[PDB]
Design a protein around this ligand. Structure first.
Ligand SMILES: *[C@@H]1O[C@H](CO[C@@H]2O[C@@H](C)[C@@H](O)[C@@H](O)[C@@H]2O)[C@@H](O[C@@H]2O[C@H](CO)[C@@H](O[C@@H]3O[C@H](CO[C@H]4O[C@H](CO)[C@@H](O)[C@H](O)[C@@H]4O)[C@@H](O)[C@H](O)[C@@H]3O)[C@H](O)[C@H]2NC(C)=O)[C@H](O)[C@H]1NC(C)=O
Ligand SMILES: [Ca+2]
Ligand SMILES: [Ca+2]
Lengths: 216, 197, 217
C-alpha cells in the first residue's frame, strides 16, 4: 500500500500502457479495482462512469449509486463512496469524454473535481472549466447535493431524478444528465437522455459517455 | 477466502466481472460474478454474446471448460459439479427475458454429469428446461442429438450451447434456442446460465 | 514471484488455466507483464500481441506509441514492440495469425518461428517457414524488414508506406499484409489501407477480427 499504486496515473508511470481494470490503494489503504484510461489526453485517468451501449439500467436508488453498479465488461458507475475516496484529498482534474452516433468526439475538462461524503450528500465541488469542445455544462451544478429518485435533494418542488430519469447533482433542473436514459441519438423527449446541453443539447443522447479523474 | 460470488458481494464487490473464489477443496478458480441481476451474487457458468467461441466441442473440452473471459465460455463440467439456477436471455432488439429454477446440480463424470434440476419458479422467457457431446452418445430420444443439433446439452426444448446463428434462422432447432422464448428458429444474442446459494 | 511464476501462456495452460483471458507472466528478465492468453485455438497456450475486433482503437500511431504498446484489455491492442522483442528474443516461438471476416469465415496462417529484433535493429522481422494456413502466406514477403510507422520511415519505398496505407508494419515496397491498418469494416474502395491480408481476402477487404499470437515451439 504505502509503496503501491494509489492512482491510475501511478500505474502509467510504472509502465502499464494498456487501458483496463487495475487494483489501486485508496488513501485509507482499501484496495479497489478501477478502470484506467491510459490513452486519452496523456493517459492515466481513473474512469468512474462509462456508458457505451445501454445494457445497464442507470435509473437506480441512493444505496445503489452509493455502492456502485454495472459491469467491468461494459457500463458502470464506480460508486459514490469510491468517488469520494478517490477525490477527497482535493486535487484531481475531471475530464468528460462524449461520442455521438457518427463517432464525433467532444470533451470537457475541469481544473478540479471532488464529491463530498455521504453525510454531505456527495456534494459536487467543481473547479474552473479549462477547455473542451463539448462546452461547460457542469459548472451550473456546482455546490449541489447528489439526488436519486428515492433521495430528492434538488431545488425543484417535484423530483428531478424522476422527471429526467437519472441521478445527478440536480438543481432546477439540469444542463447535464449523463446518468440519464440511453435513448440513442436524437430523441423528441425533453432532456431525459444522456445529454450535455452545450454539446449536442437536450434532445440528443450520446453513444458513449465517460467521466474520469487524474491527479492535478 | 470467498467461496461463491454471493460471498464476494457480501464483502463489498459491487461490479460484475471476473473474481477468484475457492472451491470446496481449496482450489482457486476465477469465475464471472453477476452482481447486478436479481439481487446479484450469481456465478455464471455459461455465456453466449457474440459467436466468437466454438461450442461444438468434445467430451474432454466440456469436462475442463473452454472459451474466454472476454466473452463466451463454458466453465467446465468438473467445475460446475464442484460448485438455485437462473437463465437470462436477450434478443437482437435488446428485449430481455429470463427463467428461474429452485434447485440445480450436476453429478460427477462417473455419473456422466447427470442433470439434477428442480422446480420452475417463474420467468418471462418461460419454461424450456424441465450430458451429451458429439463424441459421447447419451441422448434421450434414441440415435444422436449433439451432432444433429450441433451443440452439447442434456439431450430437447432448449439448446443454449447451440450455434450462434444470430436471430431468425431457417435451419431447425440448431441455434441458441429456447422453445418457450423465441422458438426453434430464433437464436438469442445473449445467453447466460448462473447459480447462487 | 518470478521463481515460481509462469513465463509463458503455455505454462499457464499446463497449470490448468483453461479459459482465454489476461494473466500475468514473467519475462526472461523477471519483469511481469499482463498478457492475453489464447487457451482455445489450436491447442491453446498462445500469447496474443495484436488484436483487432471492433475498430474502437486508433492504430495509426507513432514510433513511440508502437514501442511501448497501446489499446485496451477490454478489446483491441498492440502489446508493444519492446515487449514483443522481449517475448521472442530467446528460444523459438511459433507465430499464428487468426482472421475472421464479416461473414463469419475463419482463416489462419502459421509460421515455424518468429522473432522481432531490438529497437537498435528497428524491430527487424525474423520469420521462419510458412507451415500451413487457409489465409495463405502474406508475411514471408515481409521477412528481414525494419518496422516503420508514420513518423519513422524505414521502408523500401520512395514514399512513406505507413502514411499511404495508414498503418504500421514491416513495410517493404510496400505490403502484402497490413494488419495494423484502418478498421474499414469489410469491402473498401480505398486501396490496401485496411486490415488486409493479400492472399486471404485481398487489398480491398478489411477483416472483422485479427489476432497475432506466439507460443514456444
Ligand atoms: C537482410 O537484408 C539485408 C539488407 O537489408 C537491410 O538490412 C536488414 C537487416 C533490414 O533492416 C532491412 O530493412 C535493410 O534494408 C541483407 O544484407 C545484404 O546482404 C547481402 C548478401 O546477402 C550483401 O551483399 C554482400 O555484400 C558484401 C559486402 O558487404 C559489406 O559491404 C556492403 C556494401 O557493399 C554492406 O552493405 C554490407 O553490410 C557490408 O558492410 C560483399 O562482399 C558480397 O559480395 C555480397 O554482395 C549486402 O551488402 C547486404 N546489404 C546491406 C545493406 O548490408 C541481409 O543479408 C539480409 N539477411 C538475411 C537473413 O537474409
Ligand atoms: Ca425536489
Ligand atoms: Ca520510404
Amino acid at each position: 500500500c504505502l509503496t503501491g499504486p494509489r492512482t491510475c496515473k501511478d500505474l502509467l508511470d510504472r509502465g502499464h500502457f494498456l487501458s483496463g481494470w487495475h487494483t489501486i490503494y485508496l488513501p485509507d489503504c482499501r484496495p479497489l479495482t478501477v478502470l484506467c484510461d491510459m490513452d486519452t489526453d496523456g493517459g492515466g485517468w481513473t474512469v468512474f462512469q462509462r456508458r457505451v451501449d445501454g445494457s445497464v439500467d442507470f435509473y437506480r436508488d441512493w444505496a445503489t449509486y452509493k455502492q456502485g453498479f454495472g459491469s467491468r465488461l461494459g457500463e458502470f458507475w464506480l460508486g459514490n463512496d469510491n468517488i469520494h475516496a478517490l477525490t477527497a484529498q482535493g486535487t484531481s482534474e475531471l475530464r468528460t469524454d462524449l461520442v455521438d452516433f457518427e463517432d464525433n468526439y467532444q470533451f470537457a475538462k475541469y481544473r478540479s473535481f471532488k464529491v463530498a461524503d455521504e453525510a454531505e450528500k456527495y456534494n459536487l465541488v467543481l473547479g474552473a472549466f479549462v477547455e473542451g469542445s463539448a462546452g461547460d455544462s457542469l459548472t451550473f451544478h456546482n455546490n449541489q447535493s447528489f439526488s436519486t429518485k428515492d433521495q430528492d435533494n434538488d431545488l425543484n418542488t417535484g423530483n428531478c431524478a424522476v422527471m429526467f430519469q437519472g441521478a445527478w447533482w440536480y438543481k432546477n433542473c439540469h444542463t447535464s444528465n449523463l446518468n440519464g436514459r440511453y435513448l440513442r441519438g436524437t430523441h423528441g423527449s425533453f432532456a431525459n437522455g444522456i445529454n450535455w446541453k452545450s454539446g449536442k443539447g437536450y434532445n440528443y443522447s450520446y453513444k458513449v459517455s465517460e467521466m474520469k479523474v487524474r491527479p492535478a
